[PDB]
Enzyme design. Structure first.
Site, short mmCIF file in Angstrom:
data_model
loop_
_atom_site.label_atom_id
_atom_site.label_comp_id
_atom_site.label_asym_id
_atom_site.label_seq_id
_atom_site.Cartn_x
_atom_site.Cartn_y
_atom_site.Cartn_z
N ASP C 38 76.50 -56.10 41.55
CA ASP C 38 77.30 -54.90 41.44
C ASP C 38 77.50 -54.28 42.82
O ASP C 38 77.17 -54.88 43.85
CB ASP C 38 76.65 -53.92 40.45
CG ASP C 38 75.22 -53.57 40.82
OD1 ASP C 38 74.77 -53.93 41.92
OD2 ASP C 38 74.54 -52.92 40.00
P1 LIG Z 1 79.28 -50.13 41.79
O1 LIG Z 1 80.66 -49.73 42.25
O2 LIG Z 1 79.38 -51.37 40.93
O3 LIG Z 1 78.62 -48.90 40.91
C1 LIG Z 1 79.37 -48.32 39.89
C2 LIG Z 1 78.42 -47.85 38.79
C3 LIG Z 1 77.06 -47.53 39.40
C4 LIG Z 1 78.27 -48.98 37.77
C5 LIG Z 1 79.00 -46.60 38.12
O4 LIG Z 1 80.02 -46.98 37.24
C6 LIG Z 1 77.92 -45.84 37.35
O5 LIG Z 1 77.47 -46.28 36.35
N1 LIG Z 1 77.44 -44.55 37.84
C7 LIG Z 1 77.97 -43.98 39.06
C8 LIG Z 1 76.96 -43.00 39.67
C9 LIG Z 1 75.93 -42.39 38.72
O6 LIG Z 1 75.93 -42.70 37.58
N2 LIG Z 1 74.96 -41.43 39.21
C10 LIG Z 1 74.93 -41.03 40.60
C11 LIG Z 1 73.63 -41.52 41.24
S1 LIG Z 1 72.96 -40.23 42.33
C12 LIG Z 1 71.16 -40.13 42.08
O7 LIG Z 1 70.64 -40.82 41.28
C13 LIG Z 1 70.32 -39.15 42.90
C14 LIG Z 1 69.49 -39.85 43.98
C15 LIG Z 1 68.25 -39.05 44.37
C16 LIG Z 1 67.21 -39.92 45.07
C17 LIG Z 1 65.82 -39.77 44.45
C18 LIG Z 1 64.92 -40.97 44.77
C19 LIG Z 1 63.44 -40.62 44.72
C20 LIG Z 1 62.58 -41.67 45.41
C21 LIG Z 1 61.20 -41.13 45.81
#
Ligand SMILES: *P(=O)(O)OCC(C)(C)[C@@H](O)C(=O)NCCC(=O)NCCSC(=O)CCCCCCCCC
Ligand SMILES: [Mg+2]
Lengths: 221, 69, 79, 103, 126, 115, 87
Positions: C38
């Site tokens: 992906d």
């Molecule tokens: P790619 O183009 O194939 O991805 C596309 C995908 C991911 C498949 C999208 O269609 C999808 O499903 N979601 C898009 C984004 C989403 O759902 N959420 C945003 C993610 S931001 C997040 O999670 C915050 C990060 C904080 C970090 C914390 C980490 C702690 C570690 C100690």
């Protein structure tokens, strides 16, 4: 030309030796010249910065509305009340405690009542304030604004019977919470002879002049 | 659905930039934690909660509230 | 530098990966269907090679790499 | 009814008797109280019973701003009526030792 | 000098897995460095706990007061809080249940913190 | 401040502490010689037919100066050994648990706001 | 009441030289403006502590130097001192 004296500088009536008051005031003026204490009244919005002894001396901040300015001498205190996250809190800060770093008047205002203790039973939004609100400017040589806000009260029972004449509260919409019979019933505790009792009034006019001379003499020195 | 896909991948590699520069914590756990975090928060289809995940991810990159080193 | 030393290092760092199956590794290994990668997986493998081979590759082009041939191309003409 | 209901709390056996009715699949309370369908949420069942009989009680709830007096459906009254109806037999025959009988 | 640099080094020989160190800003008013340590068995965290405090008492800092081990009866979770550094030794299963990394990096932005409902002040019925 | 048969407010996100009837559990025993509970003391709660120990973080009774005073009595549930029952704390809590002697680092780690 | 009582183990935090005022810790028996007899502590743990104290008494007339206005304690924070910042 309006001059204001902090309430704790005027001693309570009693048999205490005035020499003790002179030494107490000298400590205040020595402490005041280090930490500036701005003029404020009950109902003003105050932000107080202190240091927490058991958290490695990290700087602390708290914002709330002043509801009570009691005490005398170096032990004078004021209470700040605020609702954080939805839970109301109160802190009784000490004016002359060296833990205090600075005092800032976010909003200088006066209310219709000397004490705002009835805000505990009032609606939550009448005591909730934004923690990081921007302080507003006060025009120089301007009368202190007086807030005529009449808060709305939660249903009875309350912490204290605020409608009874001894409290003498003029910042509550009683008609929106108490029936006419309840107001008349509370009128039975009225004491019309108190306001005309000449022997219980405290004349501080001769005292404030002496305090002002001491305050200015120390500043010149 | 999110603000922009390019931002999501840009922040993910930006986190790896910080992870490569870290000294104290474990790289194996840090890399494992960030990837599995993204694995569960995706494919939600709500199109609004993923925007909430974006802003909380953004402040993580800034680290003004907490920084892991 | 040596052009041969570029491609072999590119495939070696790809073979270092665990989750993907090193079944077909050619200059035209399309990850969407051959490896099922992906956006996150394609981004991560770029960091998997940048840490040992790179330090001058931004996101503005890394989103459209899509084949191992062109990192060899992109590394060769960058140096 | 061999022991006093107040020392156990009228709510705990209201759910327990509701639990046993679901196990027997009798659902005699559904038509007795005019409920929409069989339910397992004990609080929601008592809400319908209090709604059905128009029983309301005012209670003190501990909030972040202090104690507030609010009027709520009379759950203890609903539980007591619901327990009494079962004891009177309007909810059909029951067998509380079926599980221990089978093993 | 007793600091994080020696603290992490003292934890290396104890086979402490998943060491996490979070720089706590002074605005949080709790501490300066927050440490999370994962262990394999209850004896392992106890072994780490006794090792770190033994070095702390022996090495320097006669002025500051001593530190007690917190959570001795709790097998899953154990913690020790120094003057400016606090460590939470807990099992990895407890780490997933008690997720602490995001809370100390995201203030009020955590998934569980966002999951909880706000204050409702229950209203009257009918 | 808090004694036997005193209603309290549970602040953590423990499933036990969430009452669907809006019924507040009441303390049945205070783990102190005088039976009076101030901020940071350990008590017992009879909640939902269970005798679960609890830790008090705030009370309506006034305390010393510069100490925050809450308008409600707040409690947090802990296990029989010290681990908290709930996962996180939303309402602000005093910072005095650091100075006090006892097991307060667990709740402080999961706490969010300081006052 | 109206009887003689003695309080033990009271330390002196501050002394004012100009007004001849002693700042004893805690409360003392008697009302305001009452005469209280003061002497050294008789507690066993506080014996043999008058080594540096004036003996038999202080003589300001014969003193080589003039005492400061206020004699503070090492732990006492002066009113004019800057606000305390903890470590
Ligand atoms: P790619 O183009 O194939 O991805 C596309 C995908 C991911 C498949 C999208 O269609 C999808 O499903 N979601 C898009 C984004 C989403 O759902 N959420 C945003 C993610 S931001 C997040 O999670 C915050 C990060 C904080 C970090 C914390 C980490 C702690 C570690 C100690
Ligand atoms: Mg009262």
């Amino acid at each position: 030309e309006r001059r204001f004296l902090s309430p704790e500088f005027i001693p309570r009536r009693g048999r205490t030796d005035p020499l003790k008051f002179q030494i107490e005031r000298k400590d205040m003026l020595e402490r005041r010249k280090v930490l500036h204490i701005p003029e404020f009244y009950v109902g003003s919005i105050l932000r107080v910065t202190t240091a927490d002894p058991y958290a490695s001396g990290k700087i602390s901040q708290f914002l709330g509305i002043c509801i009570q300015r009691s005490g005398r001498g170096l032990g004078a205190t004021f209470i700040l009340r605020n609702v954080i996250e939805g839970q109301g809190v109160e802190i009784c800060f000490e004016l002359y405690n060296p833990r205090v770093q600075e005092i800032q008047v976010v909003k200088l205002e006066k209310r219709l009542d000397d004490s705002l203790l009835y805000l505990r039973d009032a609606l939550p939004e009448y005591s909730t304030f934004d923690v990081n609100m921007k302080p507003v400017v006060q025009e120089p040589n301007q009368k202190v604004p007086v807030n005529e806000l009449k808060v709305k009260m939660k249903p009875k029972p309350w912490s204290k019977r605020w409608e009874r004449p001894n409290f003498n509260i003029k910042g509550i919409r009683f008609d929106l919470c108490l029936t006419e019979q309840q107001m008349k019933e509370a009128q039975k505790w009225n004491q019309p002879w108190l306001e005309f009792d000449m022997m219980r009034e405290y004349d501080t006019s001769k005292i404030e002049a002496a305090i002002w001379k001491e305050i200015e003499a120390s500043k010149r020195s | 659905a999110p603000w922009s896909r390019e931002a999501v991948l840009s922040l993910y590699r930006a986190l790896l930039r910080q992870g490569r520069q870290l000294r104290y914590t474990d790289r194996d756990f840090y890399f494992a934690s960030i990837r599995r975090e993204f694995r569960k928060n995706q494919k939600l289809e709500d199109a609004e909660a993923r925007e909430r995940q974006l802003e909380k991810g953004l402040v993580f990159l800034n680290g003004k509230l907490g920084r892991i080193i | 530098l040596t052009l041969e030393g570029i491609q072999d290092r590119v495939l070696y760092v790809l073979k270092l990966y665990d989750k993907i199956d090193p079944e077909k590794l050619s200059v035209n290994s399309h990850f969407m269907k051959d490896l099922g990668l992906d956006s996150l997986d394609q981004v991560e493998i770029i960091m998997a090679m940048e840490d040992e081979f790179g330090f001058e590759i931004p996101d503005i082009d890394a989103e459209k790499l899509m084949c191992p041939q062109e990192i060899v191309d992109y590394i060769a003409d960058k140096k | 009814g061999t022991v006093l209901d107040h020392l156990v709390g009228e709510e705990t056996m209201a759910d327990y008797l509701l639990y046993t009715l679901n196990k027997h699949q009798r659902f005699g309370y559904v038509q007795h109280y005019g409920l929409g369908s069989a339910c397992d949420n004990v609080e929601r069942v008592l809400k319908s019973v209090a709604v059905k009989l128009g029983k309301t009680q005012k209670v003190k709830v501990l909030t972040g701003t202090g104690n507030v007096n609010i009027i709520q459906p009379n759950y203890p009254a609903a539980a007591r009526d619901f327990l009494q109806t079962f004891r009177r037999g309007l909810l059909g025959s029951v067998m509380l030792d079926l599980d221990v009988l089978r093993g | 000098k007793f600091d994080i640099d020696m603290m992490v080094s003292l934890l290396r020989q104890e086979n402490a897995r998943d060491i996490c160190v979070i720089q706590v800003p002074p605005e949080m008013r709790y501490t300066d460095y927050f440490v999370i340590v994962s262990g394999t068995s209850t004896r392992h965290l106890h072994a780490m706990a006794f090792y770190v405090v033994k070095m702390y008492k022996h090495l320097k800092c006669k002025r500051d007061p001593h530190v007690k081990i917190e959570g001795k009866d709790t097998d899953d979770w154990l913690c020790v809080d120094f003057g400016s550094m606090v460590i939470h030794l807990m099992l990895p299963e407890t780490r997933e249940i008690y997720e602490l990394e995001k809370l100390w990096t995201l203030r009020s932005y955590d998934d569980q913190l966002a999951q909880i409902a706000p204050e409702t002040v229950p209203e009257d019925f009918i | 401040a808090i004694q036997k048969m005193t209603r309290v407010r549970v602040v953590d996100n423990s499933a036990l502490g969430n009452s669907p009837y809006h019924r507040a559990p009441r303390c049945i025993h205070v783990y102190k010689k005088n039976g009076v509970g101030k901020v940071g003391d350990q008590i017992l709660l009879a909640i939902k037919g269970q005798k679960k120990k609890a830790l008090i973080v705030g009370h309506c009774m006034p305390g010393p100066r510069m100490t925050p005073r809450f308008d409600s009595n707040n409690v947090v549930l802990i296990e029989d050994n010290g681990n908290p029952v709930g996962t996180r704390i939303k309402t602000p809590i005093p910072t005095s648990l650091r100075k006090r002697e006892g097991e307060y680092s667990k709740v402080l780690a999961i706490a969010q706001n300081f006052v | 009441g109206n009887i003689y009582r003695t309080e033990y183990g009271l330390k002196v935090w501050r002394i004012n030289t100009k007004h001849n005022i002693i700042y004893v810790n805690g409360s003392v028996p008697g009302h305001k403006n009452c005469l209280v007899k003061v002497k050294d502590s008789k507690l066993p743990a506080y014996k043999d502590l008058g080594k540096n104290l004036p003996f038999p008494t202080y003589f300001p007339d014969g003193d080589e130097e003039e005492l400061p206005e206020d004699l503070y304690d090492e732990n006492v924070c002066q009113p004019g001192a800057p606000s305390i910042t903890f470590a």
